[PDB]
From Swiss-Prot, chain A:
Part of the whole protein covered: 108 to 325 of 434
Gene name linked to the record: csy1
Function (record text): CRISPR (clustered regularly interspaced short palindromic repeat) is an adaptive immune system that provides protection against mobile genetic elements (viruses, transposable elements and conjugative plasmids). CRISPR clusters contain sequences complementary to antecedent mobile elements and target invading nucleic acids. CRISPR clusters are transcribed and processed into CRISPR RNA (crRNA). Cas3 and Cascade participate in CRISPR interference, the third stage of CRISPR immunity (Potential). Involved in crRNA production or stability.
Quaternary structure and interacting proteins, as annotated: Interacts directly with Csy2; part of the Csy ribonucleoprotein complex with a probable stoichiometry of Csy1(1),Csy2(1),Csy3(6),Cas6/Csy4(1)-crRNA(1). A Csy3(6),Cas6/Csy4(1)-crRNA(1) subcomplex is also formed.
Highest classification ranks of the organism: Bacteria, Pseudomonadati, Pseudomonadota, Gammaproteobacteria, Pseudomonadales
Note: In this bacteria, Y.pestis-subtype CRISPRs do not confer resistance to phage DMS3 or MP22, but instead are required for DMS3 infection-dependent inhibition of biofilm formation and possibly motility.
UniProt-recorded name of the protein: CRISPR-associated protein Csy1
Curated annotation (Swiss-Prot), chain B:
A biological-process GO annotation: defense response to virus
Keyword Lipoprotein among record annotations: no
Ion transport is among the record's keywords: no
Lineage: Bacteria, Pseudomonadati, Pseudomonadota, Gammaproteobacteria, Pseudomonadales
InterPro entries assigned: CRISPR-assoc_prot_Csy3
Family affiliation: Belongs to the CRISPR-associated Csy3 family.
Protein name listed in UniProt: CRISPR-associated protein Csy3
Misc. remarks from the entry: In this bacteria, Y.pestis-subtype CRISPRs do not confer resistance to phage DMS3 or MP22, but instead are required for DMS3 infection-dependent inhibition of biofilm formation and possibly motility.
Pfam families the UniProt entry points to: Cas_Csy3
DNA sequence: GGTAGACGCGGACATCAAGCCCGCCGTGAAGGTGATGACTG
DNA sequence: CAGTCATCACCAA
């Protein structure tokens, strides 16, 4: 619910009707769930049913702004469309609640203690390394839409980095083992490949419709 | 009228880090090619020699830990057995412009502060501050534990304009003391150079070389590295000594501490030696703070009375306030 | 009121250097400025299994084969040469003074009460009782640890250096001076008052202690051995590694300092057995026994806080022990 | 400025005990929105 | 008497 930052407190009183009962859709339409426990007259019931429709309906005119993006896109044999992208608040809320039960939570941490007790049976936990955090607003994020219930201006960004941007230094000098003993290529990123070629060599061909297509690229 | 919510003063009297080398006397004027005192890691069999807790004092473990040894790994630097002399060399820039902040929020407060500092300067210079810094350069205060019981200490100071040198001083650092500020005519020629640096009249770059006759193979004391936020096992290192590339060293902030031990103006025990120039006058290694906030002699009372409300303190506290502004810091509200 | 400081620190007094070994002929003692050093040598050895046997792998063919097969090890060794017979051991010693003044503290009133206690000690009894026992351990050659066991003649030459050159020279004969009794004479007490002037700040003391131990031709000398610890190596490649400096076998300075402070003949078991090194909860570790337990209330942490905080002065014998621990140093604090 | 044609086997690699205490971890600035309130030309 | 400019409380895990 984006709107006036110093007016988003009556929204809690308007949206508490989806807590407890099933009468969140009783305030605007179906005011039989707003006549018996509302205790207001016809003017008050009509004014509430009129004012509560201005949330889900339009608030203002459809427009844009100079600080918006509005990219160009080339058409197949024509000019251009301006594409003004928007921030998916619903999608970022869904993926944010999805990842807060996958990085921490009950099962995703009790499986980590089960690893810490070295006795675990197979149960799936999740680990998201090297993310980044971004803040919206600043010291006060309530001027932005809600961003407060369990967001707090912290959309969690998944990594999408290239592979080869954290390298080491090349030292193949005139050494007594840095010349002749360096005929193997002792790097730090081949341990995973050596461990995979080791630990993928014990399984038989009783489930051999997938494992016979990995050593062709290795 | 209020003080600004952001104030930033750059440091003046900016020294480098000092590097250690070793040799013998009568070669100390051919001492440009002395080899560096090196950092050596050693391992120590010792003894359990701490206090013992009585909160889980099981005598099966606690009365038996005393009899068994204690194994520690430390670091140590020594002089060579051929040599008997420590050499310490560092540089020092004296900047000037020591009342103008580098970051502010007000402009009226900035003009009030600059005219307050100009009121300080155009009736007395930096000379009382400059000769106290020249005292702490002339004796070898910056050799902290190294001069303690040293037989003879010599301090050489060079004034440098280009590749060639412009002016040279030599001293006997043990004749000059640590509690007095009695001087001669030779130290006043250094004080006028430092006071021409602090007032922006000239460019000042100094090379400070200190020799200490200690002994053959005796232990010197470089600065110890603060190793913070470890979370390790049973003390793989418990003393790491600071070095630069193959040379033991002293941090620049410890030499900077030793140069600004100027304050003999603090209330309780001003006859009991100079301490460093802090806002709250605190000597942390002795666990107390001269110039408390309750006795109105700290920097955040005298500064606000003298700049804002036109309540000039005594001159001996004006030297303390101007020394705190040569120091630097974040003096905002 | 008046609890102990949570941070205490005392810098050491009597700081020695590393003792470098060298070798030559006896009666060339006064020309011994250019004697070549004793060098550490690597050697490989073929022993037997002379060790105890575990039995968690017990079988009649395992242990018999392990005994009857040889043992192959690789050690270090230091020897006198095939023409020299005397071990020259040389180090320097600084005496600082300012004993009871700590280098770091928290409580100011505890610091002043500690300096009042130490200053009350220093004037009615000087440092002379500690200084003559220190001068005894400089007089005999206690710092030669194994290198005087069975030696024929031992010869100590202590010089006092107040300039470039010596101003004062001694010459003892370290076997006539024992290791069990503190008896003095008219040449040892001059060294004792030199050390006592150094411990009370009344002058500059720097010494150059040179010892000469006639051992024999080609015999093995015993430089200090060090820990190569906290690695978890493979194969155990070196069971013994000898400490050296640039191409010269040597003794660690802390082992020399250990020998210089074997002063304590006041520990409550006996004094006729001999002195032990002054350290709190006074414990020889090579014997596995800690004399002066905290149970019988005689250790440094009980004597010091009963003497400083509660004015309960200990016996006059134990005040030498408390001041000797202050000359030692250490980290004292919250219990 | 001469090819010539070869480099050994066996066997073995140490055990013991121990790994410190104390105090502390900086401050300033990083909010949009209507809604009168004061100004108002 | 009507636009407009600086300030003002309104919220907020």
């Amino acid at each position: 619910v984006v709107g006036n930052a110093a007016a988003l407190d009556v929204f809690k009183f308007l949206s508490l009707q989806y807590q407890g009962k099933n009468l969140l859709n009783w305030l605007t339409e179906d005011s039989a769930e707003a006549l018996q426990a509302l205790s207001d007259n016809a003017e008050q019931a009509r004014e509430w049913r009129q004012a509560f429709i201005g949330i889900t309906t339009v608030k203002g005119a459809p427009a844009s702004h100079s600080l918006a993006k509005q990219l160009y896109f080339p058409l197949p044999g024509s000019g251009y469309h301006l594409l003004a992208p928007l921030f998916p608040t619903s999608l970022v809320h869904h993926v944010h609640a999805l990842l807060r039960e996958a990085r921490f939570g009950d099962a995703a941490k009790a499986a980590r203690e089960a690893r810490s007790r070295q006795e675990s049976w197979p149960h799936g936990f999740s680990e998201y390394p090297n993310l980044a955090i971004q803040k919206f607003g600043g010291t006060k994020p309530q001027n932005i839409s809600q961003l407060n219930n369990e967001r707090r201006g912290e959309n969690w960004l998944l990594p999408s980095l290239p592979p080869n941007w954290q390298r080491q230094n090349v030292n193949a000098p005139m050494r007594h083992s840095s010349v002749f003993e360096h005929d193997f290529g002792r790097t730090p990123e081949v341990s995973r490949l050596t461990r995979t070629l080791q630990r993928f060599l014990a399984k038989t061909v009783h489930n051999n419709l997938a494992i016979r297509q990995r050593r062709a690229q290795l | 009228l209020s003080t600004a919510s952001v104030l930033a003063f750059e440091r003046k009297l900016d020294p480098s880090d000092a590097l250690m080398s070793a040799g013998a006397w009568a070669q100390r004027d051919a001492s440009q090619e002395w080899p560096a005192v090196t950092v050596r890691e050693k391992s120590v069999r010792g003894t359990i020699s701490n206090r013992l807790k009585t909160k889980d004092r099981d005598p099966a473990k606690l009365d038996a830990s005393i009899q068994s040894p204690n194994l520690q790994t430390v670091d140590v630097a020594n002089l060579p057995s051929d040599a008997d002399t420590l050499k310490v060399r560092f540089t020092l820039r004296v900047l000037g412009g020591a009342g103008t902040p580098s970051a502010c929020n007000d402009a009226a407060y900035r003009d009030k502060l600059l005219q307050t500092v100009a009121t300080y300067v155009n009736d007395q210079g930096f000379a009382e501050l400059a000769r106290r810094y020249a005292h702490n350069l002339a004796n070898a205060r910056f050799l902290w534990r190294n001069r303690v019981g040293a037989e003879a200490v010599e301090v050489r100071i060079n004034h440098i304009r280009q590749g060639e040198v412009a002016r040279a001083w030599r001293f006997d650092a043990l004749a000059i003391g640590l509690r007095d500020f009695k001087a001669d005519a030779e130290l006043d020629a250094l004080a006028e150079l430092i006071a021409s640096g602090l007032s922006g009249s000239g460019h000042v770059l100094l090379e400070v070389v200190a020799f200490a006759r200690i002994g053959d193979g005796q232990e010197v004391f470089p600065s110890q590295e603060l190793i913070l936020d470890k979370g390790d096992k049973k003390g793989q290192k418990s003393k790491t000594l600071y070095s630069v590339r193959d040379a033991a060293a002293i941090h620049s902030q410890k030499i900077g501490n030793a140069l600004r031990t100027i304050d003999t103006w603090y209330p309780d025990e001003d006859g009991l030696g100079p301490i460093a120039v802090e806002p709250y006058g605190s000597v942390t290694s002795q666990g107390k703070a001269y110039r408390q906030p309750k006795q109105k002699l700290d920097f955040y009372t005298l500064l606000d009375n003298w700049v804002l409300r036109d309540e000039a303190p005594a001159v001996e506290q004006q030297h303390y306030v101007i020394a705190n502004l040569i120091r630097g810091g974040v003096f905002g509200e």
